Amino acid sequence: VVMTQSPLSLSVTPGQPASISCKSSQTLLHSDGQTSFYWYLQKPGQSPQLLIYDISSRFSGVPDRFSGSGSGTDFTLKISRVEAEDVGVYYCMQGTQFPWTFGQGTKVEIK
Amino acid sequence: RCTTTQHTSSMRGVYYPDEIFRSDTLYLTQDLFLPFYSNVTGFHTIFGNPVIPFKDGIYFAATEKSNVVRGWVFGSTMNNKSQSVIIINNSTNVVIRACNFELCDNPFFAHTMIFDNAFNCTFEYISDAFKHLREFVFKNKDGFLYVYKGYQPIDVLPSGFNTLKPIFKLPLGINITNFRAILTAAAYFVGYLKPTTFMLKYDENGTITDAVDCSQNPLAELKCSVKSFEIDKGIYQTSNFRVVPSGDVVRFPNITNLCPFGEVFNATKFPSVYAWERKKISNCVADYSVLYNSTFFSTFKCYGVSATKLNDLCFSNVYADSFVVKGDDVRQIAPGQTGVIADYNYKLPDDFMGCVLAWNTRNIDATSTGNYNYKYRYLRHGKLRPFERDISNVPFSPDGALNCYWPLNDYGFYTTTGIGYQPYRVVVLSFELLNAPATVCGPKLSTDLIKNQCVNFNFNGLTGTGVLTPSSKRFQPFQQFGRDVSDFTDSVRDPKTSEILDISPCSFGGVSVITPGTNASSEVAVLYQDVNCTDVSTAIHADQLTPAWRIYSTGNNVFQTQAGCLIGAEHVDTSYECDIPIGAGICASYHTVQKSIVAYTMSLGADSSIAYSNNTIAIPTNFSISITTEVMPVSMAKTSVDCNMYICGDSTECANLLLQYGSFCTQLNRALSGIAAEQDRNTREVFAQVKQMYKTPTLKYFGGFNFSQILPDPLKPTKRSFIEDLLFNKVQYGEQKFNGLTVLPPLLTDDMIAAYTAALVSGTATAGWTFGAGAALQIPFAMQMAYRFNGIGVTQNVLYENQKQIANQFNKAISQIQESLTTTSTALGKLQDVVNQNAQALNTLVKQLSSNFGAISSVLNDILSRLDKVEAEVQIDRLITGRLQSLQTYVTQQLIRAAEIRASANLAATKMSECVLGQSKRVDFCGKGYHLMSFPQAAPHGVVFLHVTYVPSQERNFTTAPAICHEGKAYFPREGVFVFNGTSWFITQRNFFSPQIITTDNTFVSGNCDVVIGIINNTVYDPLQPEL
Amino acid sequence: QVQLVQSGSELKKPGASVTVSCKASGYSFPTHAMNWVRQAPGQGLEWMGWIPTYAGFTGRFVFSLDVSTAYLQISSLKADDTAVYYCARGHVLEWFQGTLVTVSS
Ligand SMILES: *[C@@H]1O[C@H](CO)[C@@H](O)[C@H](O)[C@H]1NC(C)=O
């Protein structure tokens, strides 16, 4: 309902797959009128980048390794293989009718 | 188990190019042939067997006595990493195999040592079981190895000609680059084939017995040009020439940025169609492959410029118009469209357009509840102009609340519907076609300026070839280039240096060969039309010349005239009568200097003069009689063409299309018949001027004058006289053929013409001058001649006093014309000319049939037998249009030639009337001297006249006086002149010296001794004195 | 595709003001879509308004937009201000950089 963002964990074993999830309240129509869900990656360093929107369209730099999905009010991000560099905080956010509210993000570590 | 000189080819290597029987003909063709006198490498096994390059075709030959050469291996890598073919005669049969063979480094045939194993075989064939020159041709084309063979007994590279025959067309599928021989455990030769043109000569049994290598030298080229193995004499134009460009001058503007296409095609937000937006692209490199070689687009359609051509072009500006429409609107974004979007929201010009690009946005712009952010207009008081926007939103009133509407509608874009209702992003790229210095160019590299020489060039999208030179033109700062009267660039501003360069064409012109006949010598000189020979010579040595011949050179015999330059003719500082004209006052000829072709200044005539005096006269004291021969055409061949047979012979489909050209076919048949008809009118008007037939007398010697060679001989099988028989002996189409051409017979046959001619000579020989005027008179020949002398102004008595000499000169003159006519080749050149032109016109008409005029075939049955009617009609109509022009051209040219023939016939008819049927008094019409008589003779296609001419001979000088003084009176001569002879004054005739006593009865009185300037005192004889 | 460049870090004592600005590597006239996001010290991202909009924040933050020269000024600068914002481009791929203002005694 409020984008808490699932707990800050995933398997940290290198080379293994992972799934990151979030929760909201409704079909999320965007101020431009389209349904939207946004996935951003906050690197451990200087800045965020946009990965996926509306669990379907993927942005340059992450079309082969990352994939969006979900149903109802429960949405996810799939990482095909968590390939060593895939660290940082992955956020699901309401880039919709809602006033750009972000959850806590999922902390990703690889060990 | 594997173990791991140069000769002149002469005229060898001709092979039959096809499987078609031909005979009695010269066939021209282009194929890979061994060039004549090419270089062929000698190898010996006495063991030179390296890998030898194939170069797309090999001439291989060997001389044998012990079966040393067994075969060949053709391939590339000569190992098992690539396909290769082994062709071996194993003394049993011929074995051909194509495989990735494990070939030997040191092979032989004894044990067979060619290969150890074989893999991935594509072809295998075993043939039937089986001092010497064996010749082979190995040609490679489309996966096939074409092999020709032949044989000649030898004793040794032998010189000669040996036509080779085909043996194999092997479907091997191998890309062959080199080869080796297979030798037995001899000598051989290898040459290379080239795509030269040959003229092949077939004998009466269809064997090729000779040939011309069309590129060997300028004479060989001439032999192809006129389709002959022999040339007679003169200037023959055979081709043209040009200088081939050396470097490439490419100059693009200093544009280093990259065009922002993402900003046009990948933007998050697009405008609605009623309110579309435009953005400008400038000062950048446009790689257009980014929009083209990866598909996102459902629509990628360009007008004017194909999409693939965009990277080669520069534009002044590029503009991108963008908007969102539905799928059923995308089709309206085009030139020539109507509809709500095309008419009220976005109008394109009905002019060249750049590119209209579009893609589906169902998952971007459409929504599950309906996206209503996109709008379009449906109500407007009028349509938009190209690229006009009208975003006004005011109430619309159809009549200028009931019937008050808002002009905008919307697009309810949903994700639940089909394609015609899905949203599309449409981008239109407008390219401005270089109206200002380019700002947008493709990813090209530039080069430097190569000046004052023939180069290829490319400036900022402007291309061509030529010579770039700096110039004085002063362009305005906004002008990039200029043009001459024709639509061609005259000069261009350089995009990096801003200098102005004029563009001259590269040198070119016609090529003609000066030649004596080939019966004298195969020596020629070449004339290059309208060029500076500095460049011609340079292009020959620095070979950049086309055409150029393989065995040809430029010597020191090079000079230039206004007619172009000659190479090979020796300039001389003398002069002579013109033999073969070059032009601009200079002629070529073949003379001894050991002979050579020389170029000399024309002589105008003999340099001689006559002294001027105020008191003298020259008077001929003797004379001679000679006979002049004059030749002129009267008629030409009466050709006829069957229009339908020529164009649509035996074709229903063609004939039905031919009918759509209406009256054309009938008019051709009619016009040509009309021409043929006038050929009989001309013949009749020239010869049938005889009122009645006159008979040939039994006596042919009248007064000493022998007419037996002019008149028909009653003891011969013919009715022609000796001279006429000689004229006739001295000088495709049906007479049916498939081409519809034929030649019709004349109305008046050869016997009728000879009969008229004989009646006319026989008659004027005894009829006097009234032969064709009224009743014939019976006049002794000698008197008739006396009157013809009297008619010149020579006193009548001269004929009788000198009758023996006059008759003897006449006879001799007849023998002289027979000798001249009998042994020469040029006397009847005018009649040969009308014959040759007929043949050339018909040969041209027939050759045109083989042109396909763009059709798949020249033969209607090669279209119809393998093509559906719909396409066949396309191919047939193309072929018909061409043939209609061929026939129309033929008739038109035949028609103007007919007019020239009529003019000649009219002259002949006039001449018959004034020279034969009477005595002409006009100057230089019936001969060069004074006219006496003439005799027509029958000739093929024309008339030959013999004119009997009186010519004054040796003259004597006399002192003269215009008048004489006698007893105070001024006496003048009545007919003659006064002359001073051995110490006495006499009166004479101007054309013949026969002095008479000056008397009162051969003079008259006018005025007196004090009023005439330049007179003398004299005595005038008065007969009265002795009577007194 | 489109990158943004924004000013670097700054240090102020409470009071007075600081200004922040950025620019886009674009051409012609695309509009708006120059947004700002705050990253509080250990919390998630916070929206600071779309251009020139105002939402769940105070009057200290003042919006202006021209090459997309975008501005967001902070009047009456206070201690609760660190990693104050990132410029976010809303075009094509969408993109962020980040600045920093530290306020201390
Ligand atoms: C070709 O071979 C002949 C004979 O050895 C020689 O005279 C001529 O110079 C050679 N020409 C070429 C093409 O090099």
Ligand SMILES: *[C@@H]1O[C@H](CO)[C@@H](O)[C@H](O)[C@H]1NC(C)=O
């Ligand atoms: C040889 O190379 C040509 C390239 O022009 C190709 O078209 C052809 O298929 C090749 N054929 C064989 C037998 O390798």
Ligand SMILES: *[C@@H]1O[C@H](CO)[C@@H](O)[C@H](O)[C@H]1NC(C)=O
């Ligand atoms: C053509 O064949 C005939 C009959 O064999 C022969 O007499 C004649 O010489 C041949 N002519 C050629 C081969 O030119």
Ligand SMILES: *[C@@H]1O[C@H](CO)[C@@H](O)[C@H](O)[C@H]1NC(C)=O
């Ligand atoms: C944007 O970049 C180019 C624009 O032609 C092309 O790859 C595609 O349209 C877009 N790619 C994405 C979706 O990142």
Ligand SMILES: *[C@@H]1O[C@H](CO)[C@@H](O)[C@H](O)[C@H]1NC(C)=O
């Ligand atoms: C005329 O000349 C021919 C030879 O051309 C001769 O045979 C004939 O006897 C001559 N007759 C005469 C003298 O009339």
